[PDB]
Design a protein around this ligand. Structure first.
Ligand code: HEM
Length: 148
């Protein structure tokens, strides 16, 4: 595909500083859906404000985990059926922690935001479409973890 190449190329820019980019993703996410903040409970405590999350080593480790899963999806963009079982279990895990499946579309929008701000004029409508499709396929796999 041409789509798969637009993904690979766009990601190369982002994957050189994944925490920096990931931080954009989550900052945006909390700006859109502040009700997600209490779901990151480390040591039984909740963050009061979004900026509190950015000082947590464990939250930052979750950003790195996120970025690594997306990297896995990109690496496998030609065939994502190889990550399907893993993504399904990742979905189950997030169900357990309290994440609503609908929140994953906000995460999608946050990812697109982060790509748009990183790439600027290189973020073409076809790049966006490609990434929407990829992210969509990831969430489809993960959604099996809400058994459906
Ligand atoms: C939508 C909001 C999200 C919330 C609120 C959230 C929250 C959490 C929490 C609480 C954990 C367990 C603690 C931890 O490992 O840090 C976790 C684990 C994880 N999250 Fe997320 N997460 C979200 C989205 C994502 C997304 C989009 C991805 C990947 C694309 C991701 C990948 C992971 C991974 C890889 C783990 C480790 C799971 C394991 O193997 O045990 N998360 N997440």
């Amino acid at each position: 595909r041409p789509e798969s190449e637009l993904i690979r190329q766009s990601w190369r820019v982002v994957s050189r500083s994944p925490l920096e980019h990931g931080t954009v993703l989550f900052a945006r996410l909390f700006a859109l859906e502040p009700s997600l903040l209490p779901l990151f409970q480390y040591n039984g405590r909740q963050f009061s404000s979004p900026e509190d999350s950015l000082s947590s080593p464990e939250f930052l480790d979750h950003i790195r985990k996120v970025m690594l899963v997306i990297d896995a999806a990109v690496t496998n963009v030609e065939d994502l059926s190889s990550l399907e079982e893993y993504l399904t279990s990742l979905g189950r895990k997030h169900r357990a922690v309290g994440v609503r499946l609908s929140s994953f579309s906000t995460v999608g929008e946050s990812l697109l935001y982060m790509l748009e701000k990183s790439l600027g004029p290189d973020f073409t409508p076809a790049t966006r479409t490609a990434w929407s499709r990829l992210y969509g396929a990831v969430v489809q796999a993960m959604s099996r973890g809400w058994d459906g």
